[PDB]
């Protein structure tokens, strides 16, 4: 699709905000990454840029990229963005501030394209794993092993399953906003917005203050270029401060929700589950860390816990009423006993 929820698209407009670490003396780049979410366990990561790529703010094409340079957009191709995490990602779809991308897992996320007088890249921390939700935990994107139940992302961008605060935005600097009132620096709107203000010099800065500007300060770089977008409510980033005198309502959804089904997944290479006489001999040979653990079945209790991330023949003494064997977030298996070494006389010879 291109159009999935004009909830986000129409009612949001890009903005440019500071990147938390960029190492160009800490560049400002419109790819300022907040909310990395490798919270789908299926190879896929949702990333948030501070700019609203997707549809420009209109009806046409996920294949554009509209960030702010100035107070103005810069409506160019989607593919001029480069999300990456470890190895280069492959886009799945963009919607709003949010992109879904097939990426390697990563402790960080590292996005970047040339913009400004620099190379304008952006990086941020967020712990990602494509862990099974259970007694296993995994790294790399699926390419092996059995499927078993964990999170996975929606390819659907209409989701009202959660919503992120976007109600009354505020500033980011865009001193392209800030014109001059013929000696003193003058607040202006990006494309509409109730834009609040102050300078180092005295000015009113509580209430709506789009009709107030500072009449005592000349320097542009000591004043509050604002975007309270109250008709195109933008993502509320940490690198986008809020107003304090205004209130608008415009809480706006997130397109991509990690949902649980049969995620494309992993299963740590096949364990040998064999029952001998009241004993599960278990040759084990995993890849990703598997918590093997048990539930000795019957009147019995006897659990065992040991993370197995190393090949080990272990044993679990199966009782008459059974033992259970829980090779990670692979579903619990079960074993009864009375033996399984074969041959307890308890009959009458005649054969």
């Amino acid at each position: 699709d291109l159009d999935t929820h004009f909830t986000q698209y129409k009612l949001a407009r890009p903005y440019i905000a500071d990147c938390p670490n960029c190492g160009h003396s800490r560049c400002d780049s419109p790819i300022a990454i907040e909310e990395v979410r490798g919270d789908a366990h299926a190879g896929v990561i949702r990333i948030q840029t501070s700019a609203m790529f997707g549809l420009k703010t209109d009806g046409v094409d996920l294949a554009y990229m509209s960030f702010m340079n100035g107070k103005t957009q810069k409506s160019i191709k989607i593919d001029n963005l480069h999300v990456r995490t470890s190895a280069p990602c492959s886009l799945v779809s963009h919607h709003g501030y949010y992109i879904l991308a097939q990426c390697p897992p990563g402790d960080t996320v590292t996005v970047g394209f040339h913009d400004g007088p620099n190379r304008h890249t952006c990086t941020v921390a967020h712990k990602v794993e494509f862990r099974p939700v259970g007694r296993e935990k995994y790294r790399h994107p699926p390419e092996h092993g059995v499927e078993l139940p964990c999170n996975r992302y929606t390819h659907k961008r209409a989701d009202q399953g959660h919503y992120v605060e976007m109600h009354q935005p505020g500033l980011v600097a865009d001193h392209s906003l800030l014109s001059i009132h013929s000696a003193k620096v003058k607040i202006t709107v990006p494309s509409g917005a109730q834009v609040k203000y102050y300078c180092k010099c005295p000015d009113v800065r509580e209430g709506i203050t789009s009709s107030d500007h500072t009449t005592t300060c000349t320097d542009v770089k000591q004043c509050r270029a604002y975007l309270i977008d109250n008709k195109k409510w933008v993502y509320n980033s940490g690198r986008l401060p809020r107003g304090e005198g205004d209130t608008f309502k415009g809480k706006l959804h997130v397109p991509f929700v990690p949902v649980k089904a049969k995620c494309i997944a992993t299963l740590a290479p096949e364990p040998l589950v064999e029952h001998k006489h009241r004993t599960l001999i278990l040759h084990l040979h995993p890849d990703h860390p598997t918590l093997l653990t048990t539930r000795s079945l019957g009147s019995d209790a006897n659990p065992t816990r040991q993370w197995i991330e190393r090949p080990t023949t272990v044993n679990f003494t199966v009782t008459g009423e059974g033992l259970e064997y829980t090779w990670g977030n692979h579903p619990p298996k079960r074993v009864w006993a009375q033996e399984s070494g074969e041959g307890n006389p308890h009959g009458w010879p005649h054969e």
Binding site: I16, A17, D18, N21, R26, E34, R37, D39, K127, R131, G134, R135, K137, P149, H162, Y163, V164, E165, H167, P169, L171, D174, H175, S176, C199, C223, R224, A225, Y226, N236, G238, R239, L240, P241, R242, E244, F256, V257, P258, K260, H275, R295, L297, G298, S299, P303, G320, E321, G322, N329, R334, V335, A337, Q338, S340, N344, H346, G347, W348, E351
Partner: protein, 400 residues
């Protein structure tokens, strides 16, 4: 007659019980205490789930008398920082020399995973108590029916009139207050919802996945954004979710006594392998097989001609019975101490006739109370291997 039967409340075991009687013929049952049911009244106190620092946008008052105010979705962690003269594309937006402060605010807010597949606390009230009990019969073939144990229906459901419980799993093996996160159950106590405890379970405490009121501190500590430019550092400890599958506490679907594994539950521990449901049935005499329409078994002998044995289902032993009467014959090793493949097998007088059963033995010397009169039904047979397989089909264990 009125066939009491208690067995471990073990999900996957057909214990194939026997009504011992001499008025009418003994008749088989299967008192199979299938699936551990527990289910009391509960209260959702708060969802927990790994954070997402979904910043509400920092309320910034840069100079003079600071305010971080209040906007919808209360509870905001907010900390002034100085040594900044910010940038975000253009110049500084905090800039006075009376302060020079840029006030960053970040709260913990529910992740998208909070909505779906999430840790979920409960303060669980004493409430109701439930059981699930199969009763088969040496006439009737199966019914595995949910049965209450509290004030609502601890009487008849399916065949016979059956009085159920109290269970030994009337409460879960886990604590009164219980967290559940997927399959994995984490027992954690807290008194009731309010403002929780950070860096432990209930460090996020949102009443539900999308909410206004919450407790927003997963050990969320804002720090100074160095280099005179502003972003918002989130220093955060793992939540009760991240802990609970890879920084896990106690995974109760693998460490809850009995034999339990669990799903998403209010406070129920599915699949427990004890939790014993003491079943007692008031069986009308009509439902039986008559003792004269069964052999009143006499001249009991068990032998084989050829045999192969199976401890799941398929264990056989021919029987040389030359009984006083003849008829149909429900069989079972008295009171769920065998698994019988059959409900009822006919047995007459004169000759030899195999029946099927299964027991916790490798050759068939399990007593069998064949519609009156027990006998250990030996026969050479052949050892099976069939014990790699799940919850018993060899009763509560009592033979080889």
């Amino acid at each position: 007659y009125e066939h009491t039967a208690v067995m471990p409340n073990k999900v996957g075991i057909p214990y194939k019980a026997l009504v011992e009687r001499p008025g009418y013929a003994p008749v088989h049952l299967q008192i199979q205490l299938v699936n551990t049911r527990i289910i009391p009244s509960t209260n959702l106190e708060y969802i927990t789930c790994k954070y997402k620092t979904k910043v509400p946008s920092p309320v910034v008052k840069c100079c003079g008398a600071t305010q971080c105010t209040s906007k919808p979705h209360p509870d905001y962690q907010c900390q002034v920082f100085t040594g900044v003269y910010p940038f975000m594309w253009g110049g500084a937006y905090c800039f006075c020399d009376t302060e020079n402060t840029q006030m960053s605010e970040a709260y913990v807010e529910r992740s998208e995973e909070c909505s779906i597949d999430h840790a979920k606390a409960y303060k669980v009230h004493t409430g109701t108590v439930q059981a699930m009990v199969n009763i088969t019969y040496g006439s009737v073939s199966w019914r595995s029916a949910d049965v209450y144990v509290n004030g609502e229906t601890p009487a008849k459901i399916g065949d016979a009139k059956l009085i159920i419980g109290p269970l030994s799993s009337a409460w879960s093996p886990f604590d009164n207050k219980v967290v559940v996160y997927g399959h994995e159950v984490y027992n954690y106590d807290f008194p009731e919802y309010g403002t929780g405890k950070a860096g432990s379970f209930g460090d996020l405490q949102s009443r539900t996945s999308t909410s206004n009121d919450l407790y927003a501190n997963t050990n969320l500590k804002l720090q100074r954004p160095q280099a005179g430019i502003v972003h918002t550092p989130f220093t955060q400890a793992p939540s009760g979710f991240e802990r609970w599958k890879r920084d896990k506490g106690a995974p109760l679907n693998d460490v809850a006594p009995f034999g339990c594994s669990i799903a998403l539950e209010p406070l129920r521990a599915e699949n427990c392998a004890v939790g014993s449901i003491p079943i007692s049935i008031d069986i009308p005499d009509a439902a039986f097989t008559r003792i004269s329409e069964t052999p009143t078994v006499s001249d009991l002998e068990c032998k084989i001609t050829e045999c192969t044995y199976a401890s799941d289902f398929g264990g056989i032993a021919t029987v040389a019975y030359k009984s006083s009467k003849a008829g149909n014959c429900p069989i079972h090793s008295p009171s769920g101490v065998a698994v019988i493949k059959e409900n009822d097998v006919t047995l007459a007088e004169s000759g030899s006739f195999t029946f099927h059963f299964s027991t916790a033995n490798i050759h068939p010397a399990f007593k069998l109370q064949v519609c009156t009169s027990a006998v250990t039904c030996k026969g050479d047979c052949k050892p099976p291997k069939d014990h790699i397989v799940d919850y018993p089909a060899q009763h509560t264990e009592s033979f080889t």
